[PDB]
Amino acid sequence: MKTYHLNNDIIVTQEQLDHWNEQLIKLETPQEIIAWSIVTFPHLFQTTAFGLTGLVTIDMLSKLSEKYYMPELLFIDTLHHFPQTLTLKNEIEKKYYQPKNQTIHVYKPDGCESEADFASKYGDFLWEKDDDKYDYLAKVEPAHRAYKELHISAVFTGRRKSQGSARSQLSIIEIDELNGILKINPLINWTFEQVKQYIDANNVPYNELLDLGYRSIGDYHSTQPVKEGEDERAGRWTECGIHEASRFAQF
Amino acid sequence: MKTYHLNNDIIVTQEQLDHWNEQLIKLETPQEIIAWSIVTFPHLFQTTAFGLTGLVTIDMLSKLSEKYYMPELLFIDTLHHFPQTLTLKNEIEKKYYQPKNQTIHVYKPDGCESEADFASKYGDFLWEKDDDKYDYLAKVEPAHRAYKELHISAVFTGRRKSQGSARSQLSIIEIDELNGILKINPLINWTFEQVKQYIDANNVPYNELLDLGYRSIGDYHSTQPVKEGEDERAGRWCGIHEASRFAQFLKQ
Ligand SMILES: Nc1ncnc2c1ncn2[C@@H]1O[C@H](COP(=O)(O)O)[C@@H](OP(=O)(O)O)[C@H]1O
Ligand SMILES: Nc1ncnc2c1ncn2[C@@H]1O[C@H](COP(=O)(O)O)[C@@H](OP(=O)(O)O)[C@H]1O
Numbered sequence A: 001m002k003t004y005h006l007n008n009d010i011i012v013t014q015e016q017l018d019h020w021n022e023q024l025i026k027l028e029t030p031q032e033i034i035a036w037s038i039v040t041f042p043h044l045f046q047t048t049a050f051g052l053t054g055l056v057t058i059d060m061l062s063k064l065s066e067k068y069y070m071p072e073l074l075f076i077d078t079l080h081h082f083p084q085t086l087t088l089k090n091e092i093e094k095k096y097y098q099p100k101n102q103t104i105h106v107y108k109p110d111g112c113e114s115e116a117d118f119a120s121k122y123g124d125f126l127w128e129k130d131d132d133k134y135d136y137l138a139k140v141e142p143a144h145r146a147y148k149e150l151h152i153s154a155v156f157t158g159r160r161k162s163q164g165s166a167r168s169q170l171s172i173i174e175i176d177e178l179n180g181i182l183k184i185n186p187l188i189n190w191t192f193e194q195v196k197q198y199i200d201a202n203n204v205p206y207n208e209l210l211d212l213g214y215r216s217i218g219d220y221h222s223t224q225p226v227k228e229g230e231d232e233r234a235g236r237w238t239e240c241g242i243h244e245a246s247r248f249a250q251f
Numbered sequence B: 001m002k003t004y005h006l007n008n009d010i011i012v013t014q015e016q017l018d019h020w021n022e023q024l025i026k027l028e029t030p031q032e033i034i035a036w037s038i039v040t041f042p043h044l045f046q047t048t049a050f051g052l053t054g055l056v057t058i059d060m061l062s063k064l065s066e067k068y069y070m071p072e073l074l075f076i077d078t079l080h081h082f083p084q085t086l087t088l089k090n091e092i093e094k095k096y097y098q099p100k101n102q103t104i105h106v107y108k109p110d111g112c113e114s115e116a117d118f119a120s121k122y123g124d125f126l127w128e129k130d131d132d133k134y135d136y137l138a139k140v141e142p143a144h145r146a147y148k149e150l151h152i153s154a155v156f157t158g159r160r161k162s163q164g165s166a167r168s169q170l171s172i173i174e175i176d177e178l179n180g181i182l183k184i185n186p187l188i189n190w191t192f193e194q195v196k197q198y199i200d201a202n203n204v205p206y207n208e209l210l211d212l213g214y215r216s217i218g219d220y221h222s223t224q225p226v227k228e229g230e231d232e233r234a235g236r237w238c239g240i241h242e243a244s245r246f247a248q249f250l251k252q
Helices: A014-024 A028-038 A051-062 A085-099 A113-123 A131-149 A164-170 A194-201 A210-214 B014-024 B030-040 B054-066 B085-099 B113-122 B130-151 B167-171 B192-201 B206-212 B241-248
Strands: A003-005 A011-013 A044-047 A072-076 A105-107 A154-155 A172-175 A181-184 B004-005 B011-013 B046-048 B072-076 B104-105 B155-156 B173-176 B181-186
Touching: A003 A014, A011 A014, A014 A172, A014 B030, A028 A051, A028 A154, A028 B014, A028 B030, A044 A051, A051 A085, A051 A154, A051 A194, A072 A131, A085 A210, A105 A131, A105 B014, A105 B192, A164 B054, A210 B054, B011 B014, B014 B173, B030 B054, B030 B155, B046 B054, B054 B085, B054 B155, B054 B167, B072 B085, B072 B130, B104 B130, B113 B130, B130 B241
Parallel strands: A044 A072, A044 A154, A072 A105, A154 A181, B046 B072, B046 B155, B072 B104, B155 B181
Antiparallel strands: A003 A011, A172 A181, B004 B011, B173 B181
């Protein structure tokens, strides 16, 4: 019997993991997956970069929070975001978190408070010279420090099957044992049309860059706009290091 | 922190237990608690003595099974049930389980087939001669054996807060580490009236003895009826849920 060791001394067997993925596919809406997750998991957080998918989840959690509670939000500040991502964060904190006496948890690369700090520590243009090392220092390390310090056992992610590449192989529930977390992907089965429809119907704030072509937004230096025909994440071009953690299992 | 070891290598922390009890209170219907349990726990069964509360659960599970599935049913035959309890067991099997390709699981005292076998093993009238011996051999042992053999991690029980006495302090979810099971009490917040209303509205088969005054039904020798201003359970004074005292026998 394979068992998974998680933060806060939680243990999950393969049978439990398999059982959840078998039963949860029977749920008709992401709101149902989210409601179940809320009831089922203590130490439950959302991670977001304020991508459109995760904004939908924030709004869904907000509607569900009246009956239940609002799971806290974790955002990794890579120090290389578009300013527009950061202003959206403030907008989101004001709208959804401040009213509930919460602040968004923000984690940064260790010992750095700015892009210049980062370049001082590791050299200029690191994302060009060593994408792996950059990925680890900008996002993987801060996220891992966060899970451990904030005692996170489970997280919502904004990943979907229709985003393609490695994400078409996604399950509703996953285990990242290296980080000591369970991941829930409640909009796994939602298309981008569905995500946008929800954003529009519920007037949730979204990144201004979307009105300029940015259907997917990462770092200012590694993100380009895309036309309505191209892949959702074509302006980003390999799975992001925070989801594929095993390549940084040494550090 | 406190962690509980269940059957099937399943482990529950106190924080998980406390979180479930805190959130499940916010649910509005027993059906929602039931739906959640189905999704959450593998190796989920229902235990019943075919008491009125557990019958509601059976029908509720029946309707939910179309979308989900039907958790199997476990009945401990103590060999000292009222005949009509056994007659009701047949009606329920035929109505709810047969059409779903199931039989009701029936566990009896070890090495015994009937009341006469029991009496030839341990002597006549064991319940009045040694109640600890009786409760163990007739109820606790067979139940324990069933949890182990059927690899049960979690059960629905038909206990409610409104049933009075110690049941006033009941939680939605509790843990029985000695048996290696989690216990879910989905109708915890329902009154007998609510239970009776569902039984009536959905034409669920119930014990005939309930019309003859009885409100709670146990063994034939240890079950009295109740009057007007008396408690629903004030007529059979369990062990099946107080298995903790038999620890020295169960810790194997
Ligand atoms: N900087 C960051 N901070 C926190 N979570 C992040 C993150 N970057 C990515 N993620 C997680 O990974 C998901 C995929 O992001 P991307 O599609 O940009 O690769 C994000 O969904 P959302 O940003 O939609 O909530 C989020 O759940
Ligand atoms: N002989 C038996 N076999 C299986 N479960 C039993 C049992 N006796 C009691 N139980 C469980 O304990 C609950 C309370 O029983 P009681 O009130 O008679 O002590 C029962 O609810 P139901 O019998 O309503 O399903 C049932 O879940």
